[PDB]
Amino acid sequence: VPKSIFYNQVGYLISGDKRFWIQAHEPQPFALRTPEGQAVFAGMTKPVGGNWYVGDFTALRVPGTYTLTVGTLEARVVIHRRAYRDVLEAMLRFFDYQLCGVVLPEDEAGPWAHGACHTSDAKVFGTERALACPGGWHDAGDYGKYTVPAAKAVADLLLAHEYFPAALAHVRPMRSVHRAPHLPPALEVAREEIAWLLTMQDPATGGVYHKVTTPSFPPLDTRPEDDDAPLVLSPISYAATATFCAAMAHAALVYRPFDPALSSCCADAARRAYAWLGAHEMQPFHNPDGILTGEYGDAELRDELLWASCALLRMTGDSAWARVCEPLLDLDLPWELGWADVALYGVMDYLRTPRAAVSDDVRNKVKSRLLRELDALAAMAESHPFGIPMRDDDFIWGSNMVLLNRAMAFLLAEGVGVLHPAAHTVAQRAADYLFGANPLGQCYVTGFGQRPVRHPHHRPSVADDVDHPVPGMVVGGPNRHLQDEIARAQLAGRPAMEAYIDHQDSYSTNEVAVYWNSPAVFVIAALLEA
Ligand SMILES: OC[C@H]1CNC[C@@H](O)[C@@H]1O[C@@H]1O[C@H](CO)[C@@H](O[C@@H]2O[C@H](CO)[C@@H](O)[C@H](O)[C@H]2O)[C@H](O)[C@H]1O
Ligand SMILES: OC[C@H]1O[C@@H](O[C@H]2[C@H](O)[C@@H](O)[C@H](O)O[C@@H]2CO)[C@H](O)[C@@H](O)[C@@H]1O
Ligand SMILES: [Ca+2]
Ligand SMILES: [Zn+2]
């Protein structure tokens, strides 16, 4: 914990809420000054519990770089019209930096450029059958491409495009690595993953392979193009087939006015996947022998079927689908945004379907439960010193995604008549926390803030002779379970929010992932929208 001011190290929006935190004993006066030193705003800090005091300077609407002064402490804060444009663009460009089997030229990628990687055909596990499944994204700090988390990353980007297209219009991805005519930014980026996902479906049965990876993780010091181990397609899985179905049905809708051929192809692929679901058992995935890469296992598969059923309901607008959706909507499944518990994606597709196609009575029950869920998140946020909807027990592996998915839920609900008053405050607080407003004063995104992430568990950043890591990567964040050797040795006994270390070997607190950037893209685009 540093002895300083804790604030949003990226900046504050002219019209947004503006807050800073300090560990203090009592209220103190504070001032905001122009770079010369003249006071422009003054106020008194107020208690928020657990050693914390806050200062609110929301009413300062003049853009600029200000010196915030409290006690003997100083901080430089930025107020701007589009304070989050650069970070949103870097968070979206991260997916292009993760591209597999694609030359990333220096004019686009800069020092983090590299040649086409993993270009060989993959072998179907337990067969001699080879299959070409290039493209898409390296999942995270490793090079595997896993279907289940890929579905979440795609759905989050499609949702961000559906909700906030104007915010997204101001950002530029690695445009020259993508096919022309160029689509809106989130759609152009997500199409690379959608194209790869289509190659993961077995033409014979409609089933989808769980993942394509090397048999084991290569050393942390491996460049993408030096990873020459043979590629293996792990068996078809129910979770993969169901999450693929839902992501493809969602992409068929969203791409309809932009890429008709892709849209039609995704719609056909989603239906064949749904036919596979109806003919096979809900069997959890487990790594086969000799496969040591990310398992993405899950014993509960009704939420995946719920999402797949609701996605096709909205895709077709056919009331026939509501017969399967509605009983699944009644289950005591957690209503979350993945990667393992995905029911809220289905709830959203259901609630976004024209009313005439669904039971009004079920629809009202669905909306009421969503409001109760958001009230419970609002209560967590009210008791948190940083105003984020988190409890100490939520600081697990990928706790930043847990936070962002929760902010995302409030924002999504606004599109379906569920208007919680805390929605915008929660989104701002999630961004503030992600950008430094936390007990470690840590900005959880590489290349941004005054205390950026410098040593992520990310093979390209470790392996290159740059690190100085690839920018715009959201790290997993604090995980109280100490799920790596560095966390066990250096973070024992520390509070849940302090269970993070910016060390390359801390994969349980400091890895990056396509499905950790995807809710951040949604949340940051929502704030930029306003
Ligand atoms: O670390 C990011 C990913 C890097 N690519 C390999 C993937 O396998 C890895 O995924 C992560 O894999 C972890 C190790 O299996 C998953 O961690 C688990 O996260 C769970 C909650 O998401 C915790 O309950 C559980 O204690 C913890 O083990 C975590 O969610 C999930 O993001
Ligand atoms: O737990 C999965 C985690 O593993 C990381 O690879 C580790 C590997 O598990 C360990 O056995 C070996 O000694 O070290 C490597 C590199 O630290 C992998 O890089 C992560 O993507 C993954 O989440
Ligand atoms: Ca599940
Ligand atoms: Zn690759």
Side-chain angles (χ1 to χ4, degrees):
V1 179
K3 174 63 221 295
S4 53
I5 295 158
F6 297 87
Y7 61 105
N8 189 318
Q9 303 171 19
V10 168
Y12 297 91
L13 288 168
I14 286 170
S15 56
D17 213 79
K18 307 176 192 65
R19 191 164 275 213
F20 76 89
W21 288 250
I22 45 168
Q23 299 154 101
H25 164 83
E26 55 187 292
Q28 299 169 60
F30 68 87
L32 281 103
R33 315 163 178 287
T34 49
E36 41 272 20
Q38 181 101 292
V40 186
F41 188 91
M44 282 294 293
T45 63
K46 61 189 95 79
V48 292
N51 307 131
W52 305 96
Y53 274 70
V54 304
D56 195 275
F57 59 104
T58 301
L60 178 47
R61 307 294 190 185
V62 177
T65 299
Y66 294 92
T67 313
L68 164 70
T69 57
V70 65
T72 58
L73 294 171
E74 279 195 353
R76 230 93 81 79
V77 306
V78 1
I79 298 171
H80 193 270
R81 200 166 62 243
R82 274 186 308 270
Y84 313 123
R85 197 220 72 82
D86 287 356
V87 69
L88 175 62
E89 173 168 279
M91 284 169 166
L92 185 69
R93 285 173 48 91
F94 168 64
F95 297 92
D96 286 347
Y97 271 114
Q98 291 293 90
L99 284 163
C100 186
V102 163
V103 166
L104 297 176
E106 183 176 29
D107 58 17
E108 284 288 9
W112 311 277
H114 70 75
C117 58
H118 305 108
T119 55
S120 61
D121 296 341
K123 256 179 200 176
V124 180
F125 184 85
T127 80
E128 299 298 336
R129 196 166 69 253
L131 218 126
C133 45
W137 305 314
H138 297 137
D139 188 63
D142 72 303
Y143 302 130
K145 309 189 284 189
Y146 314 81
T147 305
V148 166
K152 165 164 179 58
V154 168
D156 293 344
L157 291 182
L158 296 187
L159 285 166
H161 175 75
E162 288 197 277
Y163 275 67
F164 315 114
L168 284 154
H170 294 285
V171 307
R172 182 193 178 277
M174 295 191 194
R175 216 159 254 152
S176 64
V177 316
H178 304 288
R179 194 168 74 257
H182 298 281
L183 297 189
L187 294 197
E188 172 159 275
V189 165
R191 190 163 57 179
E192 302 295 324
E193 190 77 333
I194 290 150
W196 165 72
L197 278 161
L198 289 168
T199 76
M200 296 290 282
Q201 182 175 220
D202 171 37
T205 69
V208 183
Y209 294 106
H210 191 79
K211 58 173 179 174
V212 62
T213 74
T214 55
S216 61
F217 293 119
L220 189 51
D221 212 2
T222 315
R223 289 181 162 263
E225 64 267 59
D226 302 342
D227 186 28
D228 57 1
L231 290 169
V232 180
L233 278 160
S234 277
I236 289 158
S237 79
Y238 189 98
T241 307
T243 56
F244 165 100
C245 175
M248 290 307 103
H250 193 166
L253 267 194
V254 179
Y255 286 85
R256 206 162 287 265
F258 304 98
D259 199 327
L262 183 65
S263 171
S264 178
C265 180
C266 293
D268 287 333
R271 288 190 185 100
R272 294 185 312 259
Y274 204 84
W276 185 100
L277 301 178
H280 299 81
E281 272 175 48
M282 276 182 176
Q283 168 64 44
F285 176 87
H286 297 285
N287 269 342
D289 293 350
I291 306 293
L292 306 172
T293 58
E295 193 173 70
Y296 287 107
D298 181 23
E300 181 59 69
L301 305 170
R302 289 166 297 175
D303 53 297
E304 284 69 15
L305 178 61
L306 188 162
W307 182 21
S309 310
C310 293
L312 286 159
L313 165 68
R314 192 171 67 104
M315 192 191 80
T316 66
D318 193 350
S319 58
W321 291 97
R323 253 206 207 172
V324 57
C325 301
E326 297 175 339
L328 295 167
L329 289 150
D330 191 51
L331 302 169
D332 276 339
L333 288 166
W335 278 7
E336 292 171 27
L337 290 170
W339 60 264
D341 305 292
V342 297
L344 193 63
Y345 288 106
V347 166
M348 286 307 308
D349 277 330
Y350 174 80
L351 289 178
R352 295 176 65 213
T353 296
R355 280 164 138 120
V358 310
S359 304
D360 247 298
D361 160 62
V362 175
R363 194 175 193 276
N364 290 155
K365 277 169 187 175
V366 170
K367 266 173 68 160
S368 304
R369 174 179 167 182
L370 183 52
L371 178 57
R372 290 195 311 275
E373 295 288 345
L374 301 176
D375 280 346
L377 296 174
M380 282 182 216
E382 264 223 74
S383 67
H384 199 98
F386 292 92
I388 59 162
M390 292 294 271
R391 304 157 295 178
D392 286 348
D393 49 32
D394 294 308
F395 290 95
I396 59 166
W397 198 310
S399 65
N400 288 157
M401 182 202 61
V402 175
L403 166 64
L404 290 161
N405 283 351
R406 291 175 176 181
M408 185 161 177
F410 275 96
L411 299 163
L412 285 163
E414 303 207 310
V416 293
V418 184
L419 276 60
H420 196 289
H424 291 272
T425 306
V426 165
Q428 185 64 60
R429 291 295 100 84
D432 291 340
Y433 172 98
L434 202 70
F435 303 150
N438 56 68
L440 298 170
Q442 181 74 53
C443 177
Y444 290 119
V445 185
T446 57
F448 287 89
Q450 285 67 74
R451 183 179 280 101
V453 172
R454 307 274 271 265
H455 318 281
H457 186 90
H458 183 62
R459 286 171 180 76
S461 303
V462 173
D464 63 26
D465 296 278
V466 189
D467 218 337
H468 253 277
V470 168
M473 315 197 285
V474 180
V475 294
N479 169 6
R480 78 202 287 260
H481 300 279
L482 311 177
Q483 297 167 305
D484 68 76
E485 37 125 47
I486 305 297
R488 278 186 286 269
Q490 311 294 126
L491 308 157
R494 274 150 203 201
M497 285 186 291
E498 292 168 40
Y500 166 80
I501 185 166
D502 183 14
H503 193 292
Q504 67 174 51
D505 292 314
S506 192
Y507 50 83
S508 84
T509 81
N510 206 43
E511 199 157 10
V512 296
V514 293
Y515 58 99
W516 293 349
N517 262 237
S518 65
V521 167
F522 187 94
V523 176
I524 299 305
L527 289 157
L528 276 182
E529 277 279 350

